């Protein structure tokens, strides 16, 4: 299966700094678009990524 690099990176990156990381797993595998997938979500920190519409 294809993994979402963005998420992968934040995962490791959150875990290595003791930040909540479990809510990221369900996004580890890409659904349809590596970007589109995250554009919605209200998960994890805005420290890793936030959305501005498109």
């Amino acid at each position: 299966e294809h993994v979402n690099v963005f998420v992968a990176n934040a995962l490791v990156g959150a875990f290595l700094s003791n930040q909540a990381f479990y809510d990221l797993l369900p996004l580890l595998i890409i659904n349809d678009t590596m970007i589109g997938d995250l554009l919605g979500t209200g998960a994890s920190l805005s420290q890793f990524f936030q959305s501005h519409g498109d």
């Binding site: 209200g42 920190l45 805005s46 420290q47």
Partner: protein, 98 residues
């Protein structure tokens, strides 16, 4: 539509807050304390205080560092919004310089 801020704004993803120290300004408090604590334990400064005063000074600094203030958090998550929501209603609109 651009409103500049002298601070880093990381929108909050939740509506039910909880104390959080992962803020820009929270570290600032931390560092500042850690510095002081070092100035005190400095091999050529610590001999001038009673061994007791040091312990107390340390203890205090730690309590300041780990104090449960929300301000730093608020400043990073909400404050910026509040301003953005007011801006359009001001009579004298914002006038900034980078």
């Amino acid at each position: 539509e651009v409103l500049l801020l002298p601070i880093d704004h990381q929108p909050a993803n939740v509506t039910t807050p909880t104390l959080d120290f992962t803020n820009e300004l929270t570290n600032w408090r931390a560092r500042v304390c850690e510095l002081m604590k070092n100035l005190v334990d400095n091999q050529r400064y610590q001999p001038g205080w009673t061994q007791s005063l040091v312990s107390s000074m340390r203890g205090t600094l730690d309590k300041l560092k780990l104090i449960k203030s929300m301000t730093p958090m608020y400043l990073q998550q909400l404050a910026p919004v509040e301003l953005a929501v007011i801006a359009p209603m001001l009579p004298f609109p914002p006038f900034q310089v980078p």
